[PDB]
Amino acid sequence: HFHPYNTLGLATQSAMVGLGAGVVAAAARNSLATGPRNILTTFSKSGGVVTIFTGASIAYVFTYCSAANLRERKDGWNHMWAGAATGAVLGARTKLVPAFIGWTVLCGAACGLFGWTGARFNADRKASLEQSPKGFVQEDAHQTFWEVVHRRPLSLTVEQLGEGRGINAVPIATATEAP
Amino acid sequence: IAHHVDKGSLYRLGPVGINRLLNKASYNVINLSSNTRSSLSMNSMLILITIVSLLLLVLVMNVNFIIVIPVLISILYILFS
Amino acid sequence: ELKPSSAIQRGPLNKGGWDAPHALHNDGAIDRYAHWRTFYQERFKYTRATGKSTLIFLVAFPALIGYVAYQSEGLFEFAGKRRGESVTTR
Amino acid sequence: MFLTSILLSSLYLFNRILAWQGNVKHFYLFASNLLLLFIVVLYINFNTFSNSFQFNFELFNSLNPFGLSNSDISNGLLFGIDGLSLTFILLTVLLIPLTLLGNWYNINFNSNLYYTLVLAIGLVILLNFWALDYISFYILFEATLPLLFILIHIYGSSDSERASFYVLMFTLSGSLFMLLSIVVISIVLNTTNFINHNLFVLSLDLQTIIWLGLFIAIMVKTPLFPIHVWLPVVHSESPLAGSMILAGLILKLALYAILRLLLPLLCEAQILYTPMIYIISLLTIILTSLATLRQIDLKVIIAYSSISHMGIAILGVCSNTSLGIYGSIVLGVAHGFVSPALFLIVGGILYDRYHIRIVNYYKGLTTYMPQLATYIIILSFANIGTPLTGNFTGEFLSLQGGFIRNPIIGGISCISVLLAAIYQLKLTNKLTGGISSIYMHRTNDVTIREKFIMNILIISTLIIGICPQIMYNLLYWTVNNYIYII
Amino acid sequence: ALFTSLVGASGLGFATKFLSNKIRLKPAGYYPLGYVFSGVAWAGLGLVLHNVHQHSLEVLEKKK
Amino acid sequence: IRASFDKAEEPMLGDYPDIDPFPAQL
Amino acid sequence: MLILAIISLITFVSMSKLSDNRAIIRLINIYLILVLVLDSFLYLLFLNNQTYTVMGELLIFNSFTFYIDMLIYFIMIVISSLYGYNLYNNNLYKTLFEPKKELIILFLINILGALLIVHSNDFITLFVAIELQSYSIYLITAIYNSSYKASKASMLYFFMGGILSILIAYSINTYYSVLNSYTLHSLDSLIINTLDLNLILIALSLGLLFKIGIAPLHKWLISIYENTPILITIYISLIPKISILSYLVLSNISINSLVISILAILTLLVGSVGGLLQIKIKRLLAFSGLTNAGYMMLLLLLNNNEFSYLYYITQYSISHLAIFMIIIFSIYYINYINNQYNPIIYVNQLKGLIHDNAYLVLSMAIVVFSFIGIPPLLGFFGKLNILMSILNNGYYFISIVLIVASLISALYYLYLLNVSIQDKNNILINSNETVSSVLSYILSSLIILITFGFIYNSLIIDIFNVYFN
Ligand SMILES: CCCCCCCCCCC(CCCCCCCCCC)(CO[C@H]1O[C@@H](CO)[C@H](O[C@@H]2O[C@@H](CO)[C@H](O)[C@@H](O)[C@@H]2O)[C@@H](O)[C@@H]1O)CO[C@H]1O[C@@H](CO)[C@H](O[C@@H]2O[C@@H](CO)[C@H](O)[C@@H](O)[C@@H]2O)[C@@H](O)[C@H]1O
Ligand SMILES: CCCCC/C=C\C/C=C\CCCCCCCC(=O)O[C@H](COC(=O)CCCCCCCCCCCCCCC)COP(=O)([O-])OCC[N+](C)(C)C
């Protein structure tokens, strides 16, 4: 099925990556600026960037691995919870509560929309029209995704929809027959 | 409802909150390269980062995919705000 | 030495028609009241009252309707009926 | 050669009436009035015994780009009618001379622009209901929006900039997701068509996630709950014609599009997901009909009234039952009568006389306008859903159809009769009663044209209210064409 | 049909001459032979595109 | 300002005069 | 028959005087028209996507390349029909928009440099042709020497184009180091599996792509476009984009590319939110260039992008071309004229344009609705056919960000209309002199293509089917 994540290992890897990103961004901020600056103001007039790159990188993947472990599956919801944690880190820079709540809701919704589609900026090679079976089916095959048939099996639609509303395992007229 | 919901909070997710969101994010990407009237040195120290940041970004990617997503969110944060 | 040409003779714009006389005396208090009410969203802020209303009508009330609508889905079948028969399905 | 000669004659007649006469108000009236004589004769030759599409034509085929085509290979743009498609054309064509009339003695500055824009955004919503592809339905689903943008921006009352931006932005923003869901089923099926797609099933995992792209596209057009941001503030700054044609025609289009697009190929993706439609329709009826109470402006109230009735209507469509479909159609044909009459009352007559739409100035309308206070009351009491008016037949059948599908949501949603009475009668007895106001010089009685419009929009409700069966001859196939209760 | 495909492209030509008059702030009929020029030019474009589509269809017919 | 909803609208107004609400009937 | 023109005209321009330059450009315009009319029967050479390799595995002639090869001559006729023809016959309009002596030479040298990339097979033809066209942009920029902004712009464009030329040459050299051949078909679909080529082929892509305005390095191009005069910039905004984009799209060296997908998203973000608070018209217009050149790395990620690309390129070239020609018409009616090289600078300046004439605003309205994808217009089906390929091949988040980018972009397209239909207070009642006949007939024709191209959409799809498959 799946495999649980090392929360501490992935978190400390991302902590090192966030450290390196903070260092290269502070090095970029020194040189792309004006006025009197030297070697020591790398972390003095840094704008607080290394805290951003560190805290987001820890909180996202820690919340992601923790949510994927306690739910015991992998889908787009884990990216929602992890993006909510990232919005909590990015919302605390502006020390105001309704700002903070808005960052947590909206960045979490944007990261959940990213995670639900496949959590990829690129495409999946397989499982898309050019590289997947499409069109009609040829015989009594299990209708996969991307495919069309003319009549679904009733035992499949009763499993999917339910046994309630109007849908029944026998159509209503031959259920009421004279013998 | 007509003031705390219909005109208050459904315009925050509507045409009032997005006006302020785009105002802030546009102002930051405008001010990316504000000062340094030596535009040659300003654009020329920018071409180096964008073949270094990508070059480290891909190294970080092909060891683990998950640890570039906060990097990219933080790049969007430092770029748009 | 860069001026739009001497060959324009451009004039004033009228909208044309009849000056209808004033059938309404505008009240300054009612006018500024209504201008305050229509453009209310440009000055709205989050307080405890605003947050309480937004918590109820956007979050709690759709969730309550969601519980009622998705639980009680195909229960009731009140088409014919008899006495002692099942009124629900589950 | 013959139909080319008709066009070469008619464009010349148009040119010469442009030359001698100054306005083309008369020739636009003549053309839009002859559209009735055409469409009624189309109604005469309509075979009601067939579910079939009767009058079919392809435009922009390969072998003949400028005109009609009879080939064995079709990649043009299909067009046709049955039943359903035809009741809304008949709703349309008897209303567009009334909006074209509606600003007769009003415009005074670039009138030739204005009536061209109004007639054009009426013809585009004729051909909306003629269309048969998913793209030919969609290429006229937003040919309205340019001319709507410019009809609100110029000729809008005041603060028409923001309203014009909203009528572009919100409709476009919800419309691009409709484009996504059209692209997906045009690369899966390789057919844009309204005839064949009963045959084509899709995987439930595919059918599930293309219903989203159409549902949050009709959530914008009939404005449901995370939308209807834009509806009152496009009304409240619109001109007179672009408010009648908005609220009578543009809103019922997505009532038509939830029937035409969604229900017959999304059959299995809805029954999982109707009890989200019931959530959203109920808390538009509960919420938007409750924010009507606190409204200082007078056109904004009739805007939210339109929202509340269109929220009743789409829990009759989404019932998967047989009374609710017909109830939502008779809502769409009767609200499109009673509502533009109310916009003639608010920004039509009263804004022509006093030019300010705040409610607080307006009381005592009876003592100097008796035969307007009658049109206040009978038209309000027609909007509430008193019987014998055609709004109650629709409200009744749609609440009944939404009571079949889920009875607790129907029992809660039945309170809409109360909630639609509250604000409408509160407005009616503020306007009708009291001493004639201080701020208000006495102006003219309601004139011959602003009675001629009104009595048409009142008889056309009362005939449906006395007999809702006068259009069962069209609809009795489309009562069946959309039920999936096996 | 070829004929309607000529008349429609000629109508596009009449629209070009009309709109080019109306940008220059001229009347509708300013140089009324220019309508004949634009009609013949755009109708010739319709000739060209019509014949290219004919030959393309025949190439598809010969592949069976 | 007497009622709890009148108090809850103090931070919205910026140029509004903020007068005392008194009933028109009393 | 470019070089038959260039070799002849260079001797012809060497001896003609400074007054003859207009009529020289008129001659070259009519020459290009008749090269398009009398020689456009070469479509018959291909009938089933037949491709020729000419000059010995050096040039590659197929039908995609024939279409771009025809498109560039057509837009050059529209550009050269501007310098040939007077706008009005006034003192101002002679001292504005003066063509230099060597300008008409440098256009056709640039078209030689742009055509020898789309037709190119070898890397050495790639390198020599990017050099030829990069020089021609260095000198089309700097030919208005007595302008402060234009000289600063040419000097900036020099060093940035120089860095990206050495980055391309490094990638070409590196691919040569790992495989003996230079041609792209030494790949032939068995290399790429057994060979790490992803880094080379992206660095070759990114070398050209950064020359065009891929958005981490978008700031320098916007500055050059705002600084050149308003007629150099319609040419130097159209030509290098379409020339190298049809190169990179003809030869699909970066499929599934993650770097290209990131920079595609970053382009669609920063273009649509960069154009939002901007008061200069060439700026607004150049970020509309940026988002639309970022519906391009998308198709560059795809495989089989020759309906979406070609339809969208001729859409974009007509729409681009038309809206620049609209503001070139709009400069007569404005009240304030600064800066002789660049007469209208602010989008605040074209207020109340509907009260001056209404049909130029009708034209402006159809082009600005064609940029934002309004369905009865030709600009709609371009985005429709991008999306029938993005979703076809698995790019779903790309599709959502494409949509959000289109919506954020429409907000600053419609600012042009919000400005242009307003009350002005000083309406024109009678203009004594009228605008040139042919130069307004060209814009009327470019409108009626935009508003009536869905007529011929279906013919184009059938033609396309025959001639590329
Ligand atoms: C209109 C606005 C609505 C927005 C909707 C966008 C979201 C759409 C996503 C759904 C979809 C794209 C389909 C899109 C098509 C139309 C798109 C329309 C417009 C796009 C804008 C992406 O599906 C993604 O869903 C994610 C979560 O749900 C998963 O997250 C990730 O999970 C972890 C790893 O799995 C990661 O480790 C984790 O990191 C992620 O978290 C991904 O694994 C998954 O690929 C589904 O595609 C896929 O569906 C499956 C069946 O499921 C199909 O395979 C089937 O197998 C059998 C099973 O019967 C049958 O043989 C048969 O049935 C079929 O062979 C595939 O063929 C394939 O096609
Ligand atoms: C008598 C001339 C008077 C002077 C006129 C001077 C210049 C006129 C220049 C252009 C006029 C428009 C001609 C368009 C030809 C397209 C060929 C083609 O669709 O290309 C297709 C493939 O396209 C594509 O992939 C997609 C392109 C999508 C185009 C999108 C915009 C089209 C909508 C309007 C264009 C059609 C309007 C028709 C107006 C009557 C390849 O077929 P092909 O290469 O064999 O076609 C050329 C054969 N030829 C040389 C003999 C003509």
Side-chain angles (χ1 to χ4, degrees), chain A residues 10 13-14 17 28-29 31-34 49 52-53 56-57 60-61 64 86 90 93 103 106 111 114 119 121, chain B residues 13 32 35-36 42 45-46 49 52-53 56 60-61 64-67 69-75 77-78 81:
Chain A
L10 275 297
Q13 289 178 1
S14 67
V17 172
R29 186 176 293 273
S31 58
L32 276 70
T34 187
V49 297
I52 294 169
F53 291 96
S57 295
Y60 181 87
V61 69
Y64 180 77
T86 303
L90 296 174
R93 296 286 293 172
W103 292 97
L106 295 169
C111 290
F114 180 75
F121 293 100
Chain B
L13 295 172
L32 193 280
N35 197 350
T36 65
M42 178 178 71
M45 301 180 72
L46 185 63
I49 297 168
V52 166
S53 295
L56 275 71
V60 175
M61 179 182 172
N64 288 314
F65 182 72
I66 303 301
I67 63 172
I69 297 170
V71 178
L72 294 175
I73 295 167
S74 63
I75 293 168
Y77 182 78
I78 194 172
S81 65

Side-chain angles (χ1 to χ4, degrees), chain A residues 5 64 74-79 113-120 124 126-128 132-133 142-146, chain B residues 65-66, chain D residues 177-178 180-181 184 188 203 205-206 208-214 216, chain G residues 391 395-400:
Chain A
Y5 290 165
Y64 180 77
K74 294 188 248 185
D75 58 3
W77 292 100
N78 293 318
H79 295 281
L113 182 63
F114 180 75
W116 184 48
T117 62
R120 289 178 183 179
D124 192 359
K126 294 179 180 180
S128 64
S132 177
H142 181 76
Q143 180 181 6
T144 62
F145 185 83
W146 294 110
Chain B
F65 182 72
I66 303 301
Chain D
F177 293 97
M178 183 175 168
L180 270 73
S181 175
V184 175
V188 170
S203 297
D205 289 332
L206 193 276
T208 290
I209 61 176
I210 62 100
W211 181 74
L212 294 175
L214 294 175
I216 60 101
Chain G
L391 293 173
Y395 293 96
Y396 295 109
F397 183 74
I398 303 293
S399 178
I400 296 170

Side-chain angles (χ1 to χ4, degrees), chain E residues 45 48, chain G residues 40 43 67 74 310-311 314 378 449 453 456 460 463-464:
Chain E
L45 290 173
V48 172
Chain G
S40 67
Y43 65 99
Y67 183 75
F74 180 73
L310 290 181
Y311 186 84
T314 182
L378 189 146
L449 295 173
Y456 294 103
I460 291 158
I463 289 165
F464 179 86

